[PDB]
Amino acid sequence: MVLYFIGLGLYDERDITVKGLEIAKKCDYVFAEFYTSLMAGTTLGRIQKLIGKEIRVLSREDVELNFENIVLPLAKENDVAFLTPGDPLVATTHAELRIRAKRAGVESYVIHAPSIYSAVGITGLHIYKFGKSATVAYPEGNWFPTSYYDVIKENAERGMHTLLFLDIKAEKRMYMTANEAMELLLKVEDMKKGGVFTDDTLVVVLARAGSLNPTIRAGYVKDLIREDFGDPPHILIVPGKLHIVEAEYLVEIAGAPREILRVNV
Amino acid sequence: MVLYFIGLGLYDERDITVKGLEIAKKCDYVFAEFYTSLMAGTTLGRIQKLIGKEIRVLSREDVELNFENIVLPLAKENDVAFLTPGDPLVATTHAELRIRAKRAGVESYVIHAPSIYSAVGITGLHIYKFGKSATVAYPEGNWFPTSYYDVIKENAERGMHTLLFLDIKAEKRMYMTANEAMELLLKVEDMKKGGVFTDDTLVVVLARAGSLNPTIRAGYVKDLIREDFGDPPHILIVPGKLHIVEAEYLVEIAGAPREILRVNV
């Protein structure tokens, strides 16, 4: 009679919370999705081992089109768990799954876990200063999407930081790198010429948030576009004007150039 | 000789990540602060009992002025942990403490935990749509804070939602309720008359996120300003233009008036 939406956290199998692990161990069935994101620091096997339950993996279609036929039926007579990387309900289409649950006479509860939305605080940028977020998508054929460029523009105009998620193709396990995202943005700037993203733009790169040894780098595009940030996934952040305290952290912790203390403050 | 910043999560001791627990159990000394937020579902004892360590609670002064004199000295010879509610670097000034660690020659690591910043996803509101955030601070003496009103106005104009952290006076065990925040906002509206926050403004209240049965309510100020949302902590959210699915969730899950389903595109 109960469906538990349980977050797996940021990077590996230990990023799930104590509450989440125990509840998962008490469930009769366990489902999971790895299409919105992937636990780059672990494997399905390790997650299964830690929880001690077999895990039924669901595709994007299984979820969006048949959640009520695959997951909800079982939850009507048992305790069911639905695991997602990060914090449940952050992925924009997940909140609606609780509506489906209610409609099926199934109670649902949410077990939170660390999300990149809050984890980016490790960059030293004040969380309250972040504005609208966007995802950088690869162009395709005749389609050249650039909305993410406008998001950066509207945020920075008001001193707000912009968190940029990078395109990902889970099935094919192909991630977009920060370096690639920067190239794309430089190309979008050359078209809209709005003075939003150039070689002189300051950016921050966060890789492997959640691991004990994440990669936090800050600096100008011209110096980071070819730098090696390590294994995916990467997160790109275009900061707005900085509070001196944020700048001091980027310099001391993310190896940013002293220059930002006078140029971006 | 290392310093670990470890988040405890939203509501109780089980909101700590598995990683956080394992590492905290093997630390020589454990410090913590409980003034930046309220974990309504647990006690120091339970947390100590969980990690199996005595915990020295530090006041805002001990931290902001003597962190390098109380905590860092031990981190040079032992493995020290600093515990905080939610995620340690979210809506706090704790990030700067890492700079102090560096300067004292102490290596530091950050272990995230569920934060209210991502937990807002449980309101049905698309998290990528949130704009700049703010805090509704209690007026003191003749000083009446009002900046948070402009943040709401600025976000709303661009169709972005606004997350409002609520004030806390730890040493007085006082935690601002969404009701109090609403009253303060109406007073500011009367003072500025921008038409930003009135009796007809739709708002969302999330209380005790992290608990199994949080209070999630959405509706017009006039109807919610006096409603009982339960014990703190509370956060108030002023949504911007809603997507149809956000509205459906607010109505089906947060009990919002069916009329909000009719969005003015």
Ligand SMILES: Nc1ncnc2c1ncn2[C@@H]1O[C@H](CSCC[C@H](N)C(=O)O)[C@@H](O)[C@H]1O
């Ligand atoms: N479980 C919870 N439910 C509702 N609001 C919460 C909450 N935890 C924190 N808050 C809100 O956030 C304020 C503290 S701000 C500090 C936030 C913390 N580092 C985090 O990561 O969540 C509180 O006064 C309250 O308004």
Ligand code: NA
């Ligand atoms: Na945000």
